[PDB]
């Protein structure tokens, strides 16, 4: 299991990705796409298929997509993501 953490400085903009998931607690939250020319793509830090285990230190284990969204809405200039490779 390859797990790593990345800290992204978004320079006032979005991370440049879309995540997908359900409200079923243990379903995984996955990175589904990368915006062309966006931060995620330019850094090459995260990719499609990657599972998000935590955001800003708050675990998503057994948490619905709505929780991930709640956290993202409170993201500051720097966002930390714990990633699990598929």
């Amino acid at each position: 299991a390859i797990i790593y953490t990345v800290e992204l400085k978004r320079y006032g903009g979005p991370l440049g990705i879309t995540i997908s998931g359900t409200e079923e607690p243990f379903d995984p939250i996955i990175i589904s796409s990368l915006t062309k020319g966006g931060l995620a793509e330019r850094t090459g830090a995260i990719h499609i298929g990657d599972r998000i285990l935590a955001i800003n230190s708050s675990s998503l284990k057994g948490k619905p997509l709505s929780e991930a969204i709640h956290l993202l809405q409170m993201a500051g200039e720097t966002v930390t993501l714990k990633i699990k490779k598929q």
């Binding site: 991370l15 990705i17 879309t18 997908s20 359900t22 079923e24 997509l65 969204i69």
Partner: peptide
């Protein structure tokens, strides 16, 4: 369950 997509 329903799968939703969120841009961020």
């Amino acid at each position: 369950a329903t799968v939703r997509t969120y841009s961020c």
